[PDB]
Design an enzyme around this catalytic site. Sequence first.
Site, mmCIF file in Angstrom:
data_model
loop_
_atom_site.group_PDB
_atom_site.id
_atom_site.type_symbol
_atom_site.label_atom_id
_atom_site.label_comp_id
_atom_site.label_asym_id
_atom_site.label_seq_id
_atom_site.Cartn_x
_atom_site.Cartn_y
_atom_site.Cartn_z
ATOM 1 C CB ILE A 1 -0.989 0.051 1.195
ATOM 2 C CG1 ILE A 1 -0.236 -0.010 2.525
ATOM 3 C CG2 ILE A 1 -2.006 -1.087 1.078
ATOM 4 C CD1 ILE A 1 -1.149 0.158 3.728
ATOM 5 C CB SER B 1 2.519 -5.384 17.283
ATOM 6 O OG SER B 1 3.436 -5.412 18.363
ATOM 7 C CE1 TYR C 1 -1.560 -0.595 15.005
ATOM 8 C CE2 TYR C 1 -2.625 -0.331 17.146
ATOM 9 C CZ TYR C 1 -2.659 -0.776 15.830
ATOM 10 O OH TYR C 1 -3.794 -1.396 15.346
ATOM 11 C CE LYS D 1 -4.603 1.568 12.393
ATOM 12 N NZ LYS D 1 -4.930 0.382 11.532
ATOM 13 N NE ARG E 1 -6.131 -4.400 25.858
ATOM 14 C CZ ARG E 1 -5.524 -3.751 26.848
ATOM 15 N NH1 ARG E 1 -6.184 -3.441 27.958
ATOM 16 N NH2 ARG E 1 -4.252 -3.397 26.716
#
Lengths: 341, 341
Positions: free
Chosen positions: A79, A103, A166, A170, A234
Amino acid sequence: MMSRYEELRKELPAQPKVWLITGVAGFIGSNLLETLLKLDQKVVGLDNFATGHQRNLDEVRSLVSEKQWSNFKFIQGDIRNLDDCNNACAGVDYVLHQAALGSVPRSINDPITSNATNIDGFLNMLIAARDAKVQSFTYAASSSTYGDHPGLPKVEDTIGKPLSPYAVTKYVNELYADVFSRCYGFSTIGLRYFNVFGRRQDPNGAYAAVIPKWTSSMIQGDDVYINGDGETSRDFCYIENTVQANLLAATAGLDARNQVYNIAVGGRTSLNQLFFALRDGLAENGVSYHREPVYRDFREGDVRHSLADISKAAKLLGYAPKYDVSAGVALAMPWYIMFLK
Amino acid sequence: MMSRYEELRKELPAQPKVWLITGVAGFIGSNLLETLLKLDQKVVGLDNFATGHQRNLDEVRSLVSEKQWSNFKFIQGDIRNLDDCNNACAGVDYVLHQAALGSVPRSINDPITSNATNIDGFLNMLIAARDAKVQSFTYAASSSTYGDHPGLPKVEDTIGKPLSPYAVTKYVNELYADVFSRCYGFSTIGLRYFNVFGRRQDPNGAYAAVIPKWTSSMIQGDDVYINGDGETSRDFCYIENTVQANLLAATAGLDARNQVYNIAVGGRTSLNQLFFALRDGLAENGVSYHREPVYRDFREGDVRHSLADISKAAKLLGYAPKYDVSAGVALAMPWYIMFLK
Ligand SMILES: NC(=O)c1ccc[n+]([C@@H]2O[C@H](COP(=O)([O-])OP(=O)(O)OC[C@H]3O[C@@H](n4cnc5c(N)ncnc54)[C@H](O)[C@@H]3O)[C@@H](O)[C@H]2O)c1
Ligand SMILES: NC(=O)c1ccc[n+]([C@@H]2O[C@H](COP(=O)([O-])OP(=O)(O)OC[C@H]3O[C@@H](n4cnc5c(N)ncnc54)[C@H](O)[C@@H]3O)[C@@H](O)[C@H]2O)c1
Ligand SMILES: CC(=O)N[C@H]1[C@@H](OP(=O)(O)OP(=O)(O)OC[C@H]2O[C@@H](n3ccc(=O)[nH]c3=O)[C@H](O)[C@@H]2O)O[C@H](CO)[C@H](O)[C@@H]1O
Ligand SMILES: CC(=O)N[C@H]1[C@@H](OP(=O)(O)OP(=O)(O)OC[C@H]2O[C@@H](n3ccc(=O)[nH]c3=O)[C@H](O)[C@@H]2O)O[C@H](CO)[C@H](O)[C@@H]1O
């Protein structure tokens, strides 16, 4: 009566559309592929095998009919290469963007590599998708965007500060998504996943998710490590729930567009509960494990508690997950047992 | 008595430090270079001449002593190349990161290119600076981060939604900055500039800032275009104020670190006022212009009103700007007249 997804499952085969799945050779992507091919849809896939596997594509082929597999066009590409994106988006109706490097720990050790794929790559896909005039663009966002914010459960408009590189990437996907709507009129739907799990989630590698990692460790009789006190929690979301969210978002009305949604079950599972859930699940399948967990330091960049309020997705997308953690574990354990056999 | 900056101006020459300026061949960078070299500091510069100019480096050399110029080491390189960043950061005390691709319109026409330099490049500099163990890292953020938010004046903790790809990139610089502090203990100070102007701000090119563009147009007798009703307003900040903010941030105490600050004057200037300010300023220098402005459509991705509350920088950095827009214009007009002579 039947949920919107159930209704969608009936409509799709009757009127086949062309879907693009980036990261199709990975965990979530390959599961989306299996579902879509089984619904007699045409699918284009894009993947560079950075973390994905050919075995995942081979598994899907072994699970779908010969006819359905012929409705799949795979492109080995990246991508980060606008040309690969353009080629993948050609003649596509719905884009499900899953290509990325997950991760949190990985992004801490090497933020540059995660940034290149997660941000640069995401931007190229938006451009290519826009330029290809696709009907819808759905991408994988992350519950890690809630960061340090303590409140529970998590609601979409209230987020916190990112705790890792990370988490920044996002979040940035969401930022560009919103700007593309404002500046080009290109609508998208971001799905903030909450720890997805299930078949084909890689148990190998230094960055394997907790469930695949622990399940494989138990099956092998190795020690299982808990980072912290095990009270960390979670909203584990079985892959089937996430697949539903994607197909729903890809075919949602105008009102539901340019929106980000929590995708989970609304359940709270501490790591301590998870340890026993997986252990008892394996024993249920004839796999015994008598070792106690080995507690160690909390992991850097780790979110403490994560519980999702899925009301928004339920109301606007008609999202209705049917799989709780236990049911998901019951379905997943046999896969891992067979995978390590 | 004397402000902190005035005091700093006295201390620096007595104890010379090594500074790195990325984007040193550009507007803000070359002005930082001139100031630092005149304060007998050692300076390393990094630039790829994407939008910067050798003429800017030649101008600085013509303005500083021969001895001072010998304290300058220039590296033609790209921040998108980690090796160039590593080399530039070697043995550096303070990093002033100005390398980036400005212009909101430019980012709308080509978000990919702006993203590569503004985000990827920024991340490489953070890593290189971190790995080089520099004493401080100061970077150019942007007032465009306030986006759609309507309130006035603007305060640091309250921002709005980005209106352009460029606005996203600068905001992302802040996001990574904060995460690098949390994850690696690498402190930084982000400076949200508010429309800086002054000598060496490029009047040529399709993406020239309003003041350089209008000044050159008037000097040439061409039409001057106002995007919208001319009521759009800015907190125009003369380059000297911005230079002060950088040197101040680069030498600030621990308490002032891992903070972003509005850098401006706290003044409100509508484009309509600016038109006459520049016109009267030029006439003051013997340059007549009798054309009325030509109003056209509002520009895409443009912020309506921008006025800064500089209390935070004043309190924590001891920031004390001495140049209002008029004084800045009086100093800038002669430069442009000579530039187009
Ligand atoms: N797994 C979760 O619980 C979870 C939660 C939130 C978001 N997500 C997101 O879901 C997406 C998929 O995650 P996954 O769990 O299936 O992980 P995965 O690593 O098994 O899948 C990622 C796939 O993307 C591919 N890829 C990576 N970089 C690429 C590139 N530059 N060009 C082309 N292909 C590339 C990889 O080869 C891999 O097949 C990611 O975007 C991830 O951020 C996952
Ligand atoms: N001018 C303003 O009012 C304003 C306001 C807020 C922020 N800023 C920021 O200030 C910084 C400098 O802006 P400026 O007004 O002096 O513009 P400028 O274009 O005159 O300076 C930018 C310089 O960075 C260089 N550059 C660009 N990409 C590079 C790369 N990839 N590698 C190495 N060098 C590269 C360019 O060659 C140029 O010399 C930018 O980061 C900009 O975003 C400026
Ligand atoms: C709430 C949150 O931010 N979750 C995000 C985060 O996943 P997570 O990092 O929360 O998922 P993970 O499965 O890698 O870790 C889950 C939990 O288990 C712990 N653990 C893991 C391995 C082990 O051997 N022992 C152990 O105790 C780990 O410290 C963490 O607290 O990043 C993912 C991408 O990869 C997704 O974006 C998730 O949405
Ligand atoms: C408040 C805000 O977001 N400002 C940021 C934005 O600059 P700006 O885009 O606000 O600066 P600019 O000088 O390019 O434009 C200033 C104003 O003048 C207008 N105009 C410009 C040219 C012309 O011929 N006629 C005309 O009317 C233009 O539409 C804008 O409203 O981006 C810059 C980077 O480049 C900086 O990040 C600034 O901080």
